[PDB]
Amino acid sequence: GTRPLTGEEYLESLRDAREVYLDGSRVKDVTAHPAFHNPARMTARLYDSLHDPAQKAVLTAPTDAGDGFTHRFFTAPRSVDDLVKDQAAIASWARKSYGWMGRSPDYKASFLGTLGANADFYEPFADNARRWYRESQEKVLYWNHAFLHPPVDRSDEVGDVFIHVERETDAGLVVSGAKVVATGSALTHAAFISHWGLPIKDRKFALVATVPMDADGLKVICRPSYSANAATTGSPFDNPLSSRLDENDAILVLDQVLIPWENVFVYGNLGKVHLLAGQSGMIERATFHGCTRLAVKLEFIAGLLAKALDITGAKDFRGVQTRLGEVLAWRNLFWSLSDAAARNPVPWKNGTLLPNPQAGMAYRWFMQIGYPRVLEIVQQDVASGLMYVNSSTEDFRNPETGPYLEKYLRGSDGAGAVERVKVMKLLWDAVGSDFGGRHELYERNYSGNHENTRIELLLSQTASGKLDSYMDFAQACMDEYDLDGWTAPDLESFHAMRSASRDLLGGL
Amino acid sequence: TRPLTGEEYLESLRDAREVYLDGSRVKDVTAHPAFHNPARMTARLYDSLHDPAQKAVLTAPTDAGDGFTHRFFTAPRSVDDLVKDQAAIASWARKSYGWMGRSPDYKASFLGTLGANADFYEPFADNARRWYRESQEKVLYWNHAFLHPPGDVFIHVERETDAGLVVSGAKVVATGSALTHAAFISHWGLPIKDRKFALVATVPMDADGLKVICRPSYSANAATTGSPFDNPLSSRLDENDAILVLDQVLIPWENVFVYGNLGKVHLLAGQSGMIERATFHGCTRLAVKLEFIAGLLAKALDITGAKDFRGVQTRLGEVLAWRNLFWSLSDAAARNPVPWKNGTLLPNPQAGMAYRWFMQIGYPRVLEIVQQDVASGLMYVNSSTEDFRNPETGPYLEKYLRGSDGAGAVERVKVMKLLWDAVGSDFGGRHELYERNYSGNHENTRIELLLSQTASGKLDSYMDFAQACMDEYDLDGWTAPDLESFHAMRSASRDLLGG
Amino acid sequence: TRPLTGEEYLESLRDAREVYLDGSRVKDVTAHPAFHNPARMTARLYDSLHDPAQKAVLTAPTDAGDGFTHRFFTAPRSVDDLVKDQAAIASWARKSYGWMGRSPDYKASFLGTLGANADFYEPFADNARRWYRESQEKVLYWNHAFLHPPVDRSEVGDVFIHVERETDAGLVVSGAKVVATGSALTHAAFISHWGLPIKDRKFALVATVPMDADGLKVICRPSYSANAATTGSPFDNPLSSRLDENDAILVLDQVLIPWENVFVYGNLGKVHLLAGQSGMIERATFHGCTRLAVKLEFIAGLLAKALDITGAKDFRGVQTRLGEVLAWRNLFWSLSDAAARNPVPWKNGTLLPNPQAGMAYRWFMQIGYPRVLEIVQQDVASGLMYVNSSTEDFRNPETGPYLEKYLRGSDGAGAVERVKVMKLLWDAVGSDFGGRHELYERNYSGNHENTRIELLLSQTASGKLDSYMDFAQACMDEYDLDGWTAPDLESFHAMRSASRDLLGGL
Amino acid sequence: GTRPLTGEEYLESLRDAREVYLDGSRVKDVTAHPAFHNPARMTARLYDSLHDPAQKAVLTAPTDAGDGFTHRFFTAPRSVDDLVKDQAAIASWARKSYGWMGRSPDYKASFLGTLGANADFYEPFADNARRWYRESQEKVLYWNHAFLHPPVDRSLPADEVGDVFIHVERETDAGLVVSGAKVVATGSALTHAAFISHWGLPIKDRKFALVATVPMDADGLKVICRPSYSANAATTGSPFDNPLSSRLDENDAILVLDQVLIPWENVFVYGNLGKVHLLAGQSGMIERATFHGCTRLAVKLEFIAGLLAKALDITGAKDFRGVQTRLGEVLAWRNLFWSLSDAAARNPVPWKNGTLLPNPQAGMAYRWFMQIGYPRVLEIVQQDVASGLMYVNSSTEDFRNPETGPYLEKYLRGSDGAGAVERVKVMKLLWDAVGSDFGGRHELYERNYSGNHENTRIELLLSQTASGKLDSYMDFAQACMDEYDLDGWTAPDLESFHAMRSASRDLLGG
Ligand SMILES: [Ca+2]
Ligand SMILES: [Ca+2]
């Protein structure tokens, strides 16, 4: 009746008039350019998996309308069993990219999956949500989350650097402005414009809507591409992760883009723009998605580290095994947070369920200390062994250097130099490369800075009265005694021997 | 057939147990200041078992069905049961505000599975079946004495009589032992591989030959030199980590669980199922304790007025983050269990093995934040309660020790001393040391997780995961058909640096 | 002349001082268990000043030249002096094993500079010049009472030190100070302020008050030494029973402060500058850094003995963390070395210890010392609980033989030795005494935020931060959007553009 | 008089028959290839500074022979004043490379500067040391420290895997035929000669007990490079987009010897298995190398601190209290390594022939606190600047392109009132220092610069155990225990309070 996109169909959808810029040049074909080519084929694997009959039970589910099937995470869960199956689907796609591609098409489904039960929240534009929910289910659409405001000067009415309406036509809304760190945007179908907060509180800034990536006026200015650089100066062997998994955090610029009314979710309502960051249900599911994925990535890094320690022979050392288990401990933590999130949900709109908020609010903090610790352990237990490597694959083919490398760069496993160098460069690409550096910064500030993640945690529990409960808990301990002694009947104060002991040092 | 009551439990301790403290033998354990109030606190747990308003949370039938019992003493057979297990554990944890770790329900992590795991203890399988029945019926209080003292130093058999087994040796850090009904003698690992050391059994605390040498009592010191106000936690919640010494104790055959079988003694620390439930219990309890400390810290910061500052609020939320962590680990443990013996379920091992590590870094961090955000405000206190009654000092304290909250000096000193007793006292120090090494030293906890994942092939799975990535390319480029290697522009760029 | 002896110092405490503890007034401070043994320890310090074998390290002339005094009570005029100052401080630190931080030589960080920095205290500059003289002659024991008591702010500020009346005889002052550590065993409390807090003439007061002054009261915190006397023993509580410094509340009730005791009054400006211009903070960090280095040696030796007994010393992982403690030990000796040997010029040819070395100490002590205590709790672990209640258990025939059988060390040590070190180590780490010292060394100079903030402010005001930014700016000046601006560097434009062309038509 | 090398002379000295490999090709001219071109020009700046009359007082000193002058650190100090001047000289050259080029020519001078007073230690080859000391002073030679053994398979017998180590294969009349390899030979491709040494002998055979110097143009010696971050920046980056990596990259290359003839005049130690193993602590290098690295790291932290300050000033996060605490934290670490360096220079230890070594314990501490301090500094940047580092464009051409240029200038301005160009300039410089391949390598570098995080602490424990300092600490602790026993105090001046203790015990009697 109705199927989602295939790998090729997704690729064809990117071959439009989108205006992507990189290294001063405009990218003619996004699916052909080295910066996006292999990443696009990687995303195509996700779409192709939806059509594999051996994976349909895990990955797919009916599309509410029932005319077809869709990616499971694009549908609202109505039971714990659904959320457990949601977890498997997320972990499935995560493994296909080895846990590195955070902005896979299923991530933004953390928002899209709630447009069905939470449509009325977007009044008067509630019907727009009702259709985009239907369609994003129908095609399994790829949206990017553009919400971060660009840096602004403080010197005068020039607040127009923000996304803003310049004109209200009958067709829709003429919009100019920009958003930063629009990760993966160049390979998406549409940019979802939102805000973490309005600096100027006027109607023209209060806009939440989706815009097609080929919209006239919309331009994409890329950050330096680690995948493109790996194509020209590196190799699949020397740069296994960066060359095919790099998600470009590009600048998204709108120049008088016409946003149709059918694409608007919120407009003018500064409250709903504010309430979106906590009542949309995205953050509960986004943390649910990210935690499950991070758990998968840790398995990959743990396996990488384990193979590395076997090759260097450091696996035999006791201290090294402690830190390896430490990496495994963090792996179990995020699997447990994901388990708690999926299996201990909270009731939401129209009989649907959101993953455990308290499991999600904790993930935002421990990711900022856990992931760097993992990267630190690698730098500590492998150390300079990561630098025991050659320039490129040409060094092994060159008769002048090849034999030397195989003689002096062997592993302890009985492994060859090729195997050792292969793991070391793979590990380094995950830890010390431009790609690894970006991902460390990524997993550290992915949801917010290290202060706000904890503060928003305090505020959330204060508002929910949980903080009041903790203080009442402590107060219950204090109510059981006073300056005279215990107030609880079943406890003895030992007034006699206490005063007797006090008198033992009397007159001194 | 109801379990023991609070008063009945107290009477059960008034036996011929040989407890020593400060060079003297303790005549009445339930009367001595070192154990009096802690025993009364333990009595509260037993009394809660009989409250009709708490029966739904705390209780369940006794397998035989002739009565009821504490829920954790029964083997879980569903996820719903394990969620209720969590509620029961959290309930008793709150009654002691999360400080009494070796409560009677903790050792039930072992006792609650002796029914479904009886045949593992052959030929003494019937011994497990009775101790399971009885521990259900009365809710018995056992202490886990397993830590070896630094050949005759180990628990060992000296003689095999027809009546039972003559045993000498010792155990250290027998926490709460003096107020328990029986010591469960076990081992984590055998230093000497001999039959006489391969012994797992329970011994009554009033058994002739068994002696208890106490650690310094923080509750006794608080009774004679302190007060319930100046020492709110230590004076009534102190669990003495005493030395447990056996001198030719006769262990009846009906009390032996494992003997001679060198395999089952070694295998016990991983096949008994205790470790999955003990971590489940401890994690649930620690989550409760963190709530208590969080509420304490919040009151402290509110009184000092430091709650308004942004930096302080970040670290307060950090404490709440750790609180959510152990609740999530407990949630994951209870709601994602693994199948076990006789249709029963063990809590998630993967959640419990993580708990043993993050507790060693999390709990000290919480105590550290208190020392950082309250700082010298913990020392803004007077010697004792008599200072408030003394006309010479009383009014002065009331003037100079008020809080920013608009609070009085009495309230401020009350919070500070409660917080300090939780963080910096001998009681706080012991508990810092406890929560750090309660399950093992900071090295073994991580290694045993690695060993557990290595044996299960999970570690092998991770390496296969990484290997799958390497199989998609080689020295030539990608081996996957759908990927481009860009050999042309790569070699073209190499030519830019030719000669 | 000469400073006080051990007996003379003890006799000086037997005055009309009003010390309170457990609701009762202490009749004789030198006799009460709370202060008895700690006072005898301080007496050791005074007695060391008269030992001919220690005169070269500890002593120096007294400016007037009519006698001698403790070396740190004189202003250093050379690097050699500051090195000898370090030796004097380290000497007294070892006598208390680095625990009694508020020893009489600590307050000399302020007192030792009243000579060269007397005119800063005008018009009361002459009061400073003789109190400099007098505190030098006897080696007076002053406590630094500067921390303001908690206030409600909901609206009178009578909790702060303030003048209630100005007589011709002196100044009538009421108020309080908190965490007056060691005050009960001191000769006089030196009242100062870090906070303003309110812009009023009458709160701007810096002066000294005798500890036996009528109206002055001392309200003690729970005494760890007194409790160890009644429920413990020197064996079971070796540090707390004799080294406990009571952080008491210091209360003034209409105390008449003579004009001869005033250092600063009314001058609201100098009170603010007092923290940065008294010179004390440079020397106080110098004193504390040297002492902490001494204490770490004590803990390191303690830990090593414990690990040898538990047998954990043979393990590689344990040795790494043992070496980690030694690393911190070397750190504070190096900070002290940099402080003593790289000083800064000050008033009248005198020198202050290196400020940059001392200000770093205020931060790394907050992370270093807890780490040391943590390693002990990790590598000794539950072995600290492998102990008996008290010494009576060894004497009891019913328990004695058992302890000696089951509580032996792996080194071949007896139970007595094992319990001895284990109780000594615990008293240093996990007891009320150990907890208080962790909290102390953590907040010794200020909370963990201000120590870093005051560091930023100090380098910003000195233009040092400006220097760092100019350094980075010098790098940016060597290139721009065109390429390098430096002549000797190549931009490789031809090759770069050629590589850019590799992605043409894509 | 005699002068050291100039910038041009140093560059010409590299234009020899050195066999350097990179990206499968042999480098024809090292001074011309992008991988080494700009790094060589930066090193050339150091040599040129020696001839600047405005810098001779700080940088230079007589050359023992007195026939000329030389870099001051190549001479042995005889006073505290000398080591303070040494500190200034090291800090001077460190600033010229902004504290990044760790293996500068003066680093290996930590060894060469001691060949004068410690010549007789290398008998019978003492005269070889005396002349290489003489010559290295005269031109300020650039040596690289190759000591790290290449990876070996411990599942094979040592008979098979000892050909991986540097070893003598034959003793000719001319010298010694040597084969083997060394790893992480940082900066080797731009050096004059490789100093072959060992961190102890792994196999105890005469053939491995070899300590000698080999010219970089020696026939048989090959250099296999690690991926060059400067070369990649030349083709895909720019001085604006990659300010540090493109000109400060030190390649940690593999150094391979294939039947290289080492002349007898170049041998320092041979056959003496004792001196080779004992050298790592008796050469005096470790005291000075830690002294050099500590002084340099202090300089680098100032550069990073200034960078962070500008970044926070631009983002406007500098006004926040929490951000200022961590900024001061970076300044705290900055003060730390200056203090460690001060203690090293101003509290030295006596050595051979009236010369002085910097404080060893100040240096032994440096080897540890660098492994926790520097990552913390880099962490603070990722925390306080955060995603603001990704607020950047692909390259400088985006500003030149009329289609994107104006947009960047409008939307990427700073809070400072700064333009977009300046902001992107600072962010890309900061990222190149923190998150780039160059930054990653440098994080790994400062982490294992002296050794892995375990050995650095253990060697400290062993050093203090051997010196009896560890026993001294235990005697300190013992002095406390000697003052009491099971009876009470043993010290006369202390009261045991036997009365009230037993009285209190009786209150809890029966
Ligand atoms: Ca503590
Ligand atoms: Ca990093």
Considering only CB atoms, D437 lies closest to which of A312, A313, A434, namely A434
Q: How far apart are CA C258 and CA C168, in angstroms?
A: 9
Residues from C in contact with A at Cβ < 8 Å: 22-24, 26-28, 31-33, 226, 230, 315-317, 320, 499-500, 502-506
Q: Which amino acid is at D445?
A: Y
CB D248 within 8 A of CB D96: no
DSSP secondary structure, C273-295, as one string: HHHHHSSHHHHHHHHHHHHHHHH
CB contact under 8 A, B40 and A490: yes
CB contact under 8 A, B223 and A494: yes
Residues from A in contact with C at Cβ < 8 Å: 22-25, 27-29, 32-34, 228, 232, 317-319, 322, 501-502, 504-508
Closest CA to B137 of B57, B50, B69: B69
Q: How far apart are CA D83 and CA D72, in angstroms?
A: 10
Annotated binding site of B: 144-146, 150, 175
∠ at Cα B387 (B381, B392), nearest 5°? 120
C-alpha distances (whole Å) from D432 to each of A430, B303, D37, D382, D414 are 17, 46, 19, 12, 19
Question: What is the C-alpha end-to-end distance of chain C, expressed in Å?
Answer: 93
* B249 interaction partners in chain C (CB closer than 8 Å): none
What domains sit in chain C, N to C, each tagged with a CATH number? Answer: 1-74+101-278 (no CATH), 75-99+281-461 (1.20.140.10)
Closest CA to C195 of C247, C134, C153: C153
Considering only CB atoms, B372 lies closest to which of C178, C409, C448, namely C448
* D325 interaction partners in chain B (CB closer than 8 Å): 311
Residue A112, token pair as written in the block: 């899209």
Q: Is D225 left (phi over 0), alpha (psi -120 to 50) or beta?
A: beta
Alpha carbon B348 to chain centroid, angstroms? 17
Closest CA to A26 of C339, D398, B452: D398
Bond prior to A199 in cis (omega within 30° of 0): no
- Which residues are C174's β-sheet partners? C162
CA of B429 to the centre of ligand 1 (A): 5
Q: For helices C79-95 and C280-310, what crossing angle results, to 10°? A: 50
CB contact under 8 A, D507 and B33: no
CA of B239 to the centre of ligand 1 (A): 18
Annotated binding site of C for FAD: 144-146, 150-153, 181
Closest CA to D366 of D346, D338, D347: D338
Q: Which amino acid is at D300?
A: K
CB contact under 8 A, A27 and C500: no
Q: How far apart are CA A162 and CA A179, in angstroms?
A: 8
> Residue B363 CA: which ligand is closest?
1
Bond prior to B228 in cis (omega within 30° of 0): no
CB contact under 8 A, C500 and A24: yes
The chains in contact with chain C, meaning 3 or more Cβ pairs closer than 8 Å, are A, B, D
Q: What are phi and psi of D436, to 5 degrees?
A: -75, 175
Residue located via tokens 């996990």: C430
Q: Which helix (H) or strand (E) holds D269?
A: strand D267-270
* C410 interaction partners in chain B (CB closer than 8 Å): 150
- Which residues are D2's β-sheet partners? D68
CA of B367 to the centre of ligand 1 (A): 7
CB B366 within 8 A of CB B293: yes
∠ at Cα A152 (A151, A153), nearest 5°? 135
Residues from B in contact with D at Cβ < 8 Å: 22-24, 27, 32-33, 220, 224, 309-311, 314, 493-494, 496-499
Residue C392, token pair as written in the block: 């009576």
- Which residues are A258's β-sheet partners? A174
∠ at Cα B178 (C234, B204), nearest 5°? 140
Residue located via tokens 């491995």: D208
Query: In sequence order, what are the residues at sequence separation of 6 or more whose Cβ sits closer than 8 angstroms to the Cβ of residue B53?
Result: none
CB A32 within 8 A of CB C506: yes
Q: Which helix (H) or strand (E) holds D357?
A: strand D356-357
DSSP state of D73: G
* D303 interaction partners in chain C (CB closer than 8 Å): 468, 471-472, 475
DSSP state of D68: B
* B314 interaction partners in chain D (CB closer than 8 Å): 322
Considering only CB atoms, A34 lies closest to which of C28, C317, C503, namely C503
CA of A352 to the centre of ligand 2 (A): 41
DSSP secondary structure, A408-471, as one string: HS--TTS--HHHHHHHHHHHHHHHTSHHHHHHHHHHHHSSS-TTHHHHHHHHHHHHTTHHHHHH
Residue D292, token pair as written in the block: 């050099």
Q: Which amino acid is at B474?
A: D
Count of other CB atoms within 10 angstroms of residue C487: 6
CB contact under 8 A, C382 and B173: yes
CB D54 within 8 A of CB D41: no
Residue B449, token pair as written in the block: 């997780």
Q: How far apart are CA B5 and CA B2, in angstroms?
A: 9
CB C250 within 8 A of CB C176: yes
Query: In sequence order, what are the residues at sequence separation of 6 or more whose Cβ sits closer than 8 angstroms to the Cβ of residue C208?
Result: C131, C142, C188, C189, C190, C191, C261, C263
Bond prior to C197 in cis (omega within 30° of 0): yes
Closest CA to D276 of D287, D268, D284: D268
Q: Mind telling me how many Å the CA of D121 is from chain A's nearest CA?
A: 31
C-alpha distances (whole Å) from D16 to each of D12, D144, D218 are 8, 17, 10
Residue C49, token pair as written in the block: 């000043």
What resolution does the deposited structure have, in angstroms? 2.6
Question: What is the C-alpha end-to-end distance of chain A, expressed in Å?
Answer: 96
Q: How far apart are CA C250 and CA C183, in angstroms?
A: 8
CB B411 within 8 A of CB C419: no
H helix and E strand count, chain D: 20, 16
Residue ranges in A162-265 assigned as alpha helix (H): 226-233, 242-245
Torsion sign across C-alpha atoms A187, A188, A189, A192 = negative
CB contact under 8 A, C506 and A232: no
C-alpha distances (whole Å) from C179 to each of B379, C212, C216, D304 are 7, 18, 15, 39
Q: How many CA atoms lie within 13 A of D491 on its CB side?
A: 17
Considering only CB atoms, B393 lies closest to which of C20, C159, C389, namely C20
Closest CA to B226 of B384, B415, B386: B384
Q: How far apart are CA A57 and CA A283, in angstroms?
A: 26
> Residue A439 CA: which ligand is closest?
2
Return the residue of B nearest to C499 by Cα. B493
Closest CA to D213 of D134, D288, D268, D149: D268
* B215 interaction partners in chain C (CB closer than 8 Å): 385, 387-389
Q: Which helix (H) or strand (E) holds D39?
A: helix D37-49
Q: How far apart are CA D313 and CA D418, in angstroms?
A: 10
Query: In sequence order, what are the residues at sequence separation of 6 or more whose Cβ sits closer than 8 angstroms to the Cβ of residue A281?
Result: A111, A114, A118, A348, A354
Count of other CB atoms within 10 angstroms of residue A57: 11
